[PDB]
Design a binder for this molecule. Sequence first.
Ligand SMILES: *[C@@H]1O[C@H](CO)[C@@H](O[C@@H]2O[C@H](CO)[C@@H](O)[C@H](O)[C@H]2NC(C)=O)[C@H](O)[C@H]1NC(C)=O
Ligand SMILES: *[C@@H]1O[C@H](CO)[C@@H](O)[C@H](O)[C@H]1NC(C)=O
Ligand SMILES: *[C@@H]1O[C@H](CO)[C@@H](O)[C@H](O)[C@H]1NC(C)=O
Ligand SMILES: *[C@@H]1O[C@H](CO)[C@@H](O)[C@H](O)[C@H]1NC(C)=O
Ligand SMILES: *[C@@H]1O[C@H](CO)[C@@H](O)[C@H](O)[C@H]1NC(C)=O
Ligand SMILES: *[C@@H]1O[C@H](CO)[C@@H](O)[C@H](O)[C@H]1NC(C)=O
Ligand SMILES: *[C@@H]1O[C@H](CO)[C@@H](O)[C@H](O)[C@H]1NC(C)=O
Ligand SMILES: *[C@@H]1O[C@H](CO)[C@@H](O)[C@H](O)[C@H]1NC(C)=O
Lengths: 64, 297, 119, 49, 49, 254
Amino acid sequence: SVITPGTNTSNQVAVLYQGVNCTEVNVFQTRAGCLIGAEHVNNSYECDIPIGAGICASYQSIIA
Amino acid sequence: TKCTLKSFTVEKGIYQTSNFRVQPTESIVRFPNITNLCPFGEVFNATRFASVYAWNRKRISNCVADYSVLYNSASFSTFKCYGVSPTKLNDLCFTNVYADSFVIRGDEVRQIAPGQTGKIADYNYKLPDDFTGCVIAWNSNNLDSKVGGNYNYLYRLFRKSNLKPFERDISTEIYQAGSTPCNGVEGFNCYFPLQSYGFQPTNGVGYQPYRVVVLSFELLHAPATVCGPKKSTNLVKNKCVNFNFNGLTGTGVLTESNKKFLPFQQFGRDIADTTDAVRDPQTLEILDITPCSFGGV
Amino acid sequence: EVQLVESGGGVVQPGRSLRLSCAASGFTFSSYAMHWVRQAPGKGLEWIGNIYHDGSTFYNPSLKSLVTISRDDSTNTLYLQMNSLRAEDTAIYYCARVWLYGSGYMDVWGKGTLVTVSS
Amino acid sequence: SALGKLQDVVNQNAQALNTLVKQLSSNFGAISSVLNDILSRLDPPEAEV
Amino acid sequence: SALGKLQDVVNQNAQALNTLVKQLSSNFGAISSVLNDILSRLDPPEAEV
Amino acid sequence: QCVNLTTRTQLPPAYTNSFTRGVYYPDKVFRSSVLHSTQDLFLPFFSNVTWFHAIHKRFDNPVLPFNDGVYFASTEKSNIIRGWIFGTTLDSKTQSLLIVNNATNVVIKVCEFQFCNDPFLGVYYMESEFRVYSSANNCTFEYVSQPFLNFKNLREFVFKNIDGYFKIYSKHTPINLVRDLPQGFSALEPLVDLPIGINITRFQTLLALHRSGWTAGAAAYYVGYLQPRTFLLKYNENGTITDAVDCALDPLSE
Ligand SMILES: *[C@@H]1O[C@H](CO)[C@@H](O[C@@H]2O[C@H](CO)[C@@H](O)[C@H](O)[C@H]2NC(C)=O)[C@H](O)[C@H]1NC(C)=O
Ligand SMILES: *[C@@H]1O[C@H](CO)[C@@H](O)[C@H](O)[C@H]1NC(C)=O
Ligand SMILES: *[C@@H]1O[C@H](CO)[C@@H](O)[C@H](O)[C@H]1NC(C)=O
Ligand SMILES: *[C@@H]1O[C@H](CO)[C@@H](O)[C@H](O)[C@H]1NC(C)=O
Ligand SMILES: *[C@@H]1O[C@H](CO)[C@@H](O)[C@H](O)[C@H]1NC(C)=O
Ligand SMILES: *[C@@H]1O[C@H](CO)[C@@H](O)[C@H](O)[C@H]1NC(C)=O
Ligand SMILES: *[C@@H]1O[C@H](CO)[C@@H](O)[C@H](O)[C@H]1NC(C)=O
Ligand SMILES: *[C@@H]1O[C@H](CO)[C@@H](O)[C@H](O)[C@H]1NC(C)=O
């Protein structure tokens, strides 16, 4: 799955490999799968792009 | 409405009964004006054919092909066409026609077909699974057999792998036998790939020489060059007609267009892939094709 | 018994012609097809030509018009005419024999003849 | 994106129509996806198939 | 049987997934339900069918 | 007649970026205001395209593979590049393809040429020098046509060989950039389809010497290789491909 903002905004993308461990494929391990290209932050915001298992992505670079 | 609702009493309301569609008034056939006969006499009536391992390929293009003298000739014992009916061969315009000529024995004529196995299909001449064209074969015992034995015709006996479709192997290479190399005489003596057919006229049917010509086509992907004898009709504007442009059949109204076609470009296709515009032969003009009026009654 | 013997080899000038002979003894020369094969030092075997009882001669597509295979059946012999000799034709030549009614097994072989070309 | 609920319905209906139109281009294992080509190329015993 | 409504949904979803898995073991009139067996036992003209 | 060129300067070939060049029309069908997905032998976007020079002393006529297809770009002024050689062994054993564009016409011949080690044309300061092959014995196909042709001219060509057909696609672009490939998009129209029916694995660029030894005119060319991939092409209201997307380049374009 490709997580992106609008192409009017930016061309940066993140890749989610669903149900795939990160050792079998900015690399973060979620319960949904392995997310590559998103910087995991400790802050909590509203959900902009849903990833799953409580993980959401947003553009501010792409953060998860 | 009574027939549609299956009742003799119809209640008040609106009922969808059928679909009105205007029918075409006349058929227009447009073919290239060119009138050059195709040299089938140089293919079928040739004095010499090459062997099946080195089969002869002739490209036939830019001519009018009269197929009706082929099927109605009683000389051909086998006339089997795959992907096209032989009667309809006059009505279609082809491109990239290939004539493949060779000589094989009698019971191997069944091996000139898609999906067959044998020595000829694997190592000599392979037809693809998606083959469109015609296989024509006739007995030639009184030309290709000599009383001492004719040896001008060869077939490859063994290859390391099966051939690709329409692949020619004229390469004659010494090959090994197994567990001893071909390092001279010293090992197991080295087998030769090409064996000659034993053609004598006293041989029974099944061993006798049969001449095979395989015609292979491509179905309307480029500006076509090989077309049947059909006479080109005049063009009519703004009327529902059932047209035939170089083998492309259909129904619609032909109108003037404002689509700036590039010189290579001939026709146009919609999302459904049905043709929406066409370039007519002989006059090179671009005619838009709009489907005839239809709707619900 | 079955035997193939060859003759005609030697050390010859390049461009001079050669006539290599393959005499057969012990078997009837009909119903068998005869091959000419050569091999260079440091190189593998290279097939030259085939000839049958009809007189149909088949050559290697790699080399053209250099050789000419000529069968003769009155004295059970086979001749090769080689014309316009190049420097790379230094080779050991072999005469081979196949049965027309089976697989292409070449059965017995000639012992071979040596052709050396130099200036 | 205020009116996304109506636009979603419009997009779904248009996309369903586009897919239904696109499905005519598929031959489903036949020699061609065009009926006129089959009717002009083959005899009725195999054109029927 | 207090929570039967949620259990019915869970059972229906699991049973549908199990049925979809078990449909792979059916040949549907072919010689075998395994594609590898068909590709290894038959030539491509009949293996295609 | 053959002539060895022994005044070359040793230099490795360069590499540069393809950007979004090498797109050609995949078929002869008119399409307008549509987005069409096609799977064909295309040049990948932002690929590593090999750069060869002709400058004085550089004269780049190496032996290059053909592979599945060749994109040939030319930043040309004063008409040095004249044609191409295609084949497998480039001798009389196999059959080879000759494309030349001399001062009069464009000639395509399929013959068994015994090619020279350094095939070339020549301009005297008039064209009076032609050393490409030493013999031509068995010729099957001949085709004489119209002339196809700071760096001022950009020539893009796409050479493909499928089913015995050699497809040449061409585009001519007026540019004013000095050294590298301009960054932009230009769809290559099909130029010619040749029924040559021969095996091609190797190709050669033909250049022209300048004589007043020899002098090489200022020219530069680029060789890229086609791969089977999918593009999403955009057709405008005039039927011209104005933009393209490489489906396997990055996840955004995917
Ligand atoms: C130009 O140079 C090439 C490469 O050095 C020459 O090709 C060689 O020529 C010699 C002499 O006949 C042969 O023995 C070699 O086998 C050739 N090499 C190859 C790879 O074929 C070429 O002959 C030179 N041109 C001229 C006119 O002499
Ligand atoms: C071959 O010759 C026969 C002899 O009359 C003729 O009837 C036939 O039409 C010829 N075939 C072709 C293809 O010319
Ligand atoms: C015949 O068709 C060609 C196109 O193939 C065209 O150029 C030519 O003008 C036509 N001739 C006539 C008399 O219509
Ligand atoms: C192109 O290839 C060369 C060597 O093959 C390599 O050094 C260079 O980094 C490559 N360039 C790109 C952009 O990949
Ligand atoms: C083309 O030539 C190459 C090498 O010259 C060879 O490996 C390949 O098999 C040839 N292909 C055909 C179809 O002849
Ligand atoms: C161009 O090449 C053709 C083909 O051989 C030849 O007939 C013609 O004379 C050449 N013209 C010049 C100016 O060399
Ligand atoms: C090719 O040319 C050579 C020499 O000119 C000739 O011996 C050979 O027969 C030719 N090949 C064919 C198929 O005509
Ligand atoms: C299409 O062609 C017209 C001229 O007929 C031109 O005005 C228009 O700008 C063209 N479209 C584009 C996108 O350039």
